[model samples]
Target: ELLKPRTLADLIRILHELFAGDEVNVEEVQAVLEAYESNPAEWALYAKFDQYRYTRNLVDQGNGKFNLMILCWGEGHGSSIHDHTDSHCFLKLLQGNLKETLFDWPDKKSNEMIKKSERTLRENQCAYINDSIGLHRVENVSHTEPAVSLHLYSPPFDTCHAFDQRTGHKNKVTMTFHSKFGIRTP
Candidate 1:
């Protein structure tokens, strides 16, 4: 049976249990999938956000981890090629389509970034990101529809290193937290 996390609290509890030992296991990832599969529509509801609409919600797990999110992207919505300084992330697609282009650092001094990887994720699909091999960006390649995704991070995603692809300059941006339950500012 699929595990449906009825509320954000339930989801947080499950995540906490999964990461209790400071390691992520296949079972934990499976549990997350089950939760999404069980209540796909309800989970999609969490994607709704005010203001920019491009950014829907950022679920703060308190204690340092947060879920940065976005939903219903148009033709031009895309993130810059960047990496999270010391955070690990998981991205799950809930609706439409998303194409990810990943780059790898050959060595310490290689200024040349190559398009070493590409992935097309559909509904109910997910991807993982870490410091070692997580420098990448995603875009809505579909010209017909919008894409939606959920991102979950650990130790609360407070800050991240954003890169300017053109200038090769990096900037640190602070993350804000939000959810249906309420909002938490840091």
Candidate 2:
């Protein structure tokens, strides 16, 4: 088991150390994520939300190994089905709740996708996924409350493809940060 962190900064420092080695320890990474309590006060600076869509705020852009960010989801907002681009995505819910729906990999011939499973994550809970686990869409299921989730992406990616639910047609999407290092973007 990993030692619990007393603060958010401590959590970040521990993650940096975990990724410093040649290989990342998966269990320890997950343990650390679970150890930290979901407290909004610590992440207030990067917790801005948008009515148009979910906002991704950059926190610690890891040392070429990973990138950490806080995703703020507006009430009733959800993402399109998408892949991780061969990266490992670990998400920890920091506030409210979310629902994740998994889909089978897009078919090469017909370009179709099939429903797989769905999971609901409460505050302080964490989930991990990769391309092998199939594509997924995360959303704030609450129509009255906003949600916040902390995501860690190993081998950061700037672009990914969003698949059309009906035809499974994929389109490239470039990610943007609403705030970087606590500063809002233009």
Candidate 3:
């Protein structure tokens, strides 16, 4: 089928169809993601700037089901080492770069862990993290240039747990949207 998505709304609609089942087949999702990649110019609509952190949102669907948003990162910005609200997600980096670090907890009962490994995601790189995976962190590789990326989450959640490696404790916080439906709110 020639979707030829005319807007981000159309694009997300097509993605919703592609992810209709109980699970999102990676290959199918990738195919849809590639469609967006082919027309990178369209992503400009999703971009916005934030100095302290990334912000953008409300491309939501079916209550808690499907959620997609564009995240903008200023140089030297990064996310806390945390869990993905127990939901599966994918992050597609369209510009600039980031250093992703995966964590390994030998025992979930313990907070102590060692640095597992790391990878640098350049432009056009996408990372899929299943809910089953452990916590991880992402940091901008450079502060001189900003970065933009698309994040898609299934069964959107209002809260996520941040881990304190020293205490083996998880702290929960509400998620906020800087903008919704093209409107940025204070």
Model 3: per-residue Cα lDDT at residue 26: 73
Top lDDT model: 2
lDDT of each: 0.62, 0.90, 0.72
lDDT of 1 at 107: 46
Model 3 alpha-carbon miss at residue 25, Å: 1.4
Candidate 1 off by > 4 Å: 1-12, 38-40, 49-53, 60-72, 106-112, 177-186
**Compared to the true structure, candidate 1 yields what TM-score?**
0.74
Model 3, 1-186: lDDT tens digits are 435456656768777776676776776675566456524566665576776787765545534467888788888888867778768778878788988888763465765755678899878677877547767888886958888877888777678877675765778977888777657777
* TM-score, model 3 to reference: 0.83
Candidate 3 Cα deviation (angstroms), residue 120? 0.9
Q: Which residue pairs collide, candidate 2?
A: none
The clash numbers for all candidates, in the given order, read: 5, 0, 2
What's each prediction's TM-score?
0.74, 0.95, 0.83
Model 1 / residue 137 / CA error / Å: 0.2
What's model 3's lDDT at 49?
Answer: 74
Off by over 4 Å in 3: 1-10, 38-41, 60-64, 105-111
Instruction: Give the backbone clash total of model 1.
Output: 5
Alpha carbon deviation, residue 56, candidate 3 (Å): 3.5
Give per-residue CA lDDT, model 2, range 34-84, as digits (tens): 899977789999999987899999999888889999999999999999999
